[PDB]
């Protein structure tokens, strides 16, 4: 059904596909990323996505309370998901703040990243059109680093709080506040524009990318796997957790979304179409990103792995460079950053609404007493703004990288996806879950879903976790910056805040229940009505 796609496809795709996947793929050397990416997509991604929507429809209890009807012991999965959402909402909006700053900087006769006659540029700047004719730096890269970001020399040096970036964060949070409070969302005739425009802009950037002199050398780097050397655990964890991040699984937002749907519909085809569409747009936009990078390699006369940032700044370096190469660059820069703001804001609205309704159910006697709901929304937005304010400082990039690596990705998604699949397959029961799916949608999942939940997803999550611990290498920003041990510990604390929820809730519910230990366990394993 055309409408069934059009309504939700443009909101399910978000900044993950356009921004995180290109930067993670570039960080891991291009073609080697795609092998563990497609292994996780079909081994785990589509099966765990189908699993979470089924839980949502089956329980109709939201992202947290759903586990009471499946396995009371593992209710901590809901709290882990809700704190993953809480951490994601703090850092994800910083990308919209950067996009907003870029959009206001676009209102010029000449784009500021197109040249470096400007005051913020180092004497090492050389225009890319002349560079190939040393330690030279590109005007776009040091624009990113010094005007927008003001990159401090380390996380130990927070520096000054950037007032412009703080006001951009305030602007986006005000927009989120009013849209969530008033319930504004694309449902009128504007949905067609909101869905079509991102794909149109992506296709325009694709055609600009593929036609630039060097696009083929960038598409070689993007598709040729380094199978003989690249199989470190970092590429396995990155590629695996990118699938879980892009599908918004392990967040409990999928269960919440499914809780508002009637359990009498063909879930399977809709989930398989939405997931294959999302992974398709990610993979396709990869061609544009890497053909822009491969053109930059041929213009500047350096290797494709050295043209740009092995980090979040990849998109803010590549796409501005692309729109610099187009007729009337101001128009395309403005359109690109409006597209980015729309695509990020829709996802942010979904995630904040999911967080709000998840947290309201934990105290409806005070969190839902009429306008107390608006008060709670304002409190959540203010707290998230004050938390994001730490990343507006000159050293905010390192905090942002730590948050992206640890707080809502990596081992925590592997942990949540492993416990979901393990509980449903083994503790609750694969036969029970398949019978329930029969009752709802009319047919059993079949062997692929059954064995993906029973073996493949647990084996992939445990293999990636153990390989990460056995062959541990620490996080870095870009290619060379090394985090201090205290910042690594902070990132691991961010991750453990989500991970520890399951053991903590297990021991709490064991404490809360009377009777002998085995009777407690039997009581807390059996579902409630």
């Amino acid at each position, epitope marked *: 059904k055309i409408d069934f796609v059009l309504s939700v496809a443009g909101g399910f795709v978000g900044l993950g596909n356009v921004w995180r996947f290109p930067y993670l793929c570039y960080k891991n050397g291009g073609g080697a990323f795609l092998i563990p990416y497609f292994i996780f997509l079909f081994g785990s991604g589509l099966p765990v996505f189908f699993l979470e929507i089924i839980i949502g429809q089956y329980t109709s209890e939201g992202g947290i309370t759903c586990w009471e009807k499946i396995c009371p012991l593992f209710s901590g999965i809901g709290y882990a998901s809700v704190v993953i959402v809480s951490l994601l909402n703090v850092y994800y909006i910083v990308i919209l703040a950067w996009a907003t700053y870029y959009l206001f900087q676009s209102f010029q006769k000449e784009l500021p990243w197109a040249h470096c006659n400007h005051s913020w540029n180092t004497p090492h700047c050389m225009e890319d059109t002349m560079r190939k004719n040393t330690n030279f730096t590109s005007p776009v890269i040091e624009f990113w680093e010094r005007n927008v970001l003001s990159l401090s020399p380390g996380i130990d040096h927070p520096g000054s709080l950037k007032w412009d970036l703080a006001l951009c964060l305030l602007l986006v949070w005000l927009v989120c506040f009013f849209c969530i409070w008033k319930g504004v969302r694309s449902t009128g005739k504007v949905v067609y524009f909101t869905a079509t425009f991102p794909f149109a802009m992506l296709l325009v950037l694709l055609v600009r990318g593929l036609t630039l002199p060097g696009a083929g050398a960038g598409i070689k780097f993007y598709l040729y796997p380094d199978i003989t050397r690249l199989e470190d655990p970092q590429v396995w964890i990155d590629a695996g957790t990118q699938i879980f991040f892009s599908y918004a699984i392990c967040l409990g937002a999928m269960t919440s979304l499914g809780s508002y749907n009637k359990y009498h519909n063909n879930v399977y085809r809709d989930c398989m179409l939405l997931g294959c569409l999302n992974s398709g747009t990610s993979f396709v936009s990869g061609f544009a990103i890497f053909s822009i990078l491969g053109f930059m390699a041929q213009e500047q006369g350096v290797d494709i792995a050295d043209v740009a940032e092995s980090g979040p700044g990849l998109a803010f370096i590549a796409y501005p460079k692309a729109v610099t190469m187009m007729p009337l660059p101001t128009f395309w820069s403005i359109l690109f950053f409006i597209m980015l703001l729309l695509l990020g804001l829709d996802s942010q609205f979904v995630e904040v609404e999911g967080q709000i309704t998840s947290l309201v159910d934990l105290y409806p006697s005070f969190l839902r007493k009429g306008y107390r709901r608006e008060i709670f929304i304002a409190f959540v937005c203010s707290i998230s703004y004050l938390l994001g304010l730490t990343m507006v400082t000159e050293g905010g990039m390192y905090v942002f990288q730590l948050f992206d690596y640890y707080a809502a990705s990596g081992v925590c998604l592997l942990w949540v996806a492993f416990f979901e699949c393990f509980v449903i397959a083994w503790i609750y029961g694969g036969n029970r879950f398949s*019978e329930d799916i029969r009752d709802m949608i009319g047919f059993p999942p079949g062997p692929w879903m059954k064995y993906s939940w029973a073996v493949i997803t647990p084996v992939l999550c445990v293999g990636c976790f153990i390989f990460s611990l056995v062959k541990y290498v620490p996080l870095t920003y870009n290619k060379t910056y090394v985090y201090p041990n205290w910042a690594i510990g902070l990132g691991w604390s961010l991750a453990l805040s989500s991970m520890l929820c399951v053991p903590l809730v297990i021991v709490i519910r064991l404490c809360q229940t009377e009777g002998p230990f085995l009777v407690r366990v039997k009581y807390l394993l059996t579902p409630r009505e």
Partner: antibody
Amino acid sequence: EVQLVESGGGLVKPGGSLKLSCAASGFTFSSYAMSWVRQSPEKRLEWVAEISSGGRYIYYSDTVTGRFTISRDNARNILHLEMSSLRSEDTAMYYCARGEVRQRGFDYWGQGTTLTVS
Amino acid sequence: ENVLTQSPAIMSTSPGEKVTMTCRASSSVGSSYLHWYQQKSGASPKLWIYSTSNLASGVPARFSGSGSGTSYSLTISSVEAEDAATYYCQQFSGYPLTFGSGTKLEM
């Protein structure tokens, strides 16, 4: 997926009770939902009851909802139907049908047993 | 209960002629949840068409099915002696399950 064989049909007085049986073979009976379908002497097909593959979900038609009790023995691959109070209108031939996929329907039908009340 | 009705209660037909049998529903039935069954005289019914077009394992290709919403039909390109049987439409979209009144080919 080969064979189904009903048993237990016969003659009982109105208001009596009877228990039908349906044996299964050639497939994993525990993995398939089973249903009873009823054909009146007027040849009209009427659905009676459905039991899920694990027996957790059970449905009845409104005309038998209070009087009939479907059950299954996954360990023996035999399906059962229990009737408490047979009215005059219940006389018919009963077929057990394999109905695991609602989008595909009743793949296989047993030979059936005639039930008479008078 | 979604009552299903079939119009041509009896069809005396000469061999080789095309035949179409209509099925009508009191309520909207999903296309995936309507099926057709054949029943030869003196034998148990057998699945014939499912999901409104998908022919069963043993049904000859001469049979076909079409429909949507509250109207459904089964067609035969050319009837024959082997096709003389009673055909029932059935909805699987919601309980209680209901079968159509059934139509018998008479020649």
